[PDB]
Amino acid sequence: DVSFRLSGADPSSYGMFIKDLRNALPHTEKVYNIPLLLPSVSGAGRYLLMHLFNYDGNTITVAVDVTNVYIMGYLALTTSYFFNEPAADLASQYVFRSARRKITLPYSGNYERLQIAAGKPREKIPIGLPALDTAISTLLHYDSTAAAGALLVLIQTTAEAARFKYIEQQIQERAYRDEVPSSATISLENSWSGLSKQIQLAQGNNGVFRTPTVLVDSKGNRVQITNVTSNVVTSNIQLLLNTKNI
């Protein structure tokens, strides 16, 4: 368990939640000083439970695969909800078995299918701590269209912030006012797998990527990352997806 309370939340307590989230993910090595997530984990140890409390103190518990930071499903009162995909179905064998009923959401967890279900891309969905409080409250009342948008908010404010310090900082800036994610934020989210792969390939290649990774920077400009000396590698990314899962 890691925990976050929106009641009384500020940039510091959110920082501590994101720190806790990162520290709960097991790893045996660092690659260029960045934790390398495990190739796999067998049984219930695969999944971390995040306890989130909205402002009024209602709670959901979110199940996260510790090898890839993917949200598999969540529990809200006595009802469990899982994405419609095999990994989630497998997770439902291990978490929230005490739920009185289990609902399978009518989409998978990937951004493309979530955006379809929600009626909108995530460029247009404001994120922040208030949006996170809203998302928690939404997931309490099954509505599958509303839940898709809530889940885009949740994934970005939790998993994506764990992966990148820049995104954590973006959410901290939106502690008391939501705002659509920066282009750079979207870019990083979409590049995580690729960055993770190229950082791993750079080991044995003198710190140079085999294939450059294109990102958008904080001013809106398209930039190529070619090696591990980039600030994206030294001072941004916090977790690497294992190339075994790429």
Ligand X SMILES: *[C@@H]1O[C@H](CO)[C@@H](O)[C@H](O)[C@H]1NC(C)=O
Q: For residue 35, report the phi and psi dihedrals to the nearest 5 degrees.
A: -50, 130
230 touching ligand X, by CB under 6 A: yes
Q: After which residues is the chain broken (C to N over 2.5 A)?
A: none
Angle between helices 165-173 and 183-202 (to 10 degrees): 160
226 touching ligand X, by CB under 6 A: yes
236 touching ligand X, by CB under 6 A: no
Q: Which amino acid does the sequence have at 76?
A: A
Smallest separation, CB 234 to ligand X (Å): 9
223 touching ligand X, by CB under 6 A: no
The smaller minimum CB distance to ligand X, of residues 196 and 230, is found at 230
Q: Is 73 annotated as a binding residue?
A: no
The smaller minimum CB distance to ligand X, of residues 170 and 230, is found at 230
- Between CA 157 and CA 198 the distance in angstroms is 25
Q: Is 163 annotated as a binding residue?
A: yes
**Which region among 45-53, 147-155, 172-180, 223-231 touches ligand X (by CB under 6 A)?**
223-231
Instruction: Please state, as a whole number, how many other Cβ atoms lie within 10 Å of the Cβ of residue 176.
Output: 11
- Exposed, middle or buried, 54 (CB in 10 Å: 0-12/13-18/19+)? buried
Instruction: Please state, as a whole number, how many other Cβ atoms lie within 10 Å of the Cβ of residue 238.
Output: 20
Q: Is 109 annotated as a binding residue?
A: yes
Smallest separation, CB 181 to ligand X (Å): 24
Judge whether 189 counts as a catalytic residue: no
Q: 23 in helix, strand or coil?
A: helix
Q: Is 29 annotated as a binding residue?
A: no
- Exposed, middle or buried, 118 (CB in 10 Å: 0-12/13-18/19+)? buried
Tokens of 106: 């009518």
- H/E stretch holding 29 reads strand 27-31
227 touching ligand X, by CB under 6 A: yes
Active-site residue among 160, 168, 173, 189? 160
The label of the residue with tokens 């000396």 reads 229
The smaller minimum CB distance to ligand X, of residues 134 and 236, is found at 236
224 touching ligand X, by CB under 6 A: no
Pick the binder of ligand X from 7, 229, 235, 244 (CB under 6 A).
229
Q: Where in the sequence numbering do the catalytic residues fall?
A: 160
Q: List residues binding ligand X (CB under 6 A).
A: 208, 226-227, 229-230
Binding site residue list for N-acetyl-alpha-D-glucosamine: 71, 111, 163
